[PDB]
Amino acid sequence: DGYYKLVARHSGKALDVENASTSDGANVIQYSYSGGDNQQWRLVDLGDGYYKLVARHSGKALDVENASTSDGANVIQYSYSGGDNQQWRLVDLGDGYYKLVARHSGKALDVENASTSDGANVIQYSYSGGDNQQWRLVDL
Ligand code: NA
DSSP states (O other): OOOOEEEETTTOOOEEEEEGGGSSTBEEEOOOOOOGGGEEEEEEEEEEEEEEEEEETTOOOEGGGOOOOOOTEEEEEEEOOOOEEEEEEEESSSOOOOEEEEEOOEEEEEEGGOOSSSTTOOOOOOOOOOOGGOOOEEEE
């Protein structure tokens, strides 16, 4: 495809733009994989190990809301403008999983509280090896 699904290790559920909204600011969540275009991501190499992740349905990018550097800052989709809060380091963890670390904050893509529920919020948080902070990049 050129596209990937990103599946959280703990839940087996996919990185998802909520309700397939194409809007700037639409929330990014975890949700059971259905093959929806809002659950498919283009991994675009920016060099130096950084990538932008672009949702297939909207062409908008994985974005840490307002470039907050806090543990727990929200992850959303937003039109790409080259912000460091829209660039992600894809780090191979050694066992088939990755962490994705936001360039501006050094914080990892994280399913809040390791919830396995559909609709659990995706945020950033310091990496501490939780399975809710590890992602399988599955080639579509
Ligand atoms: Na989110």
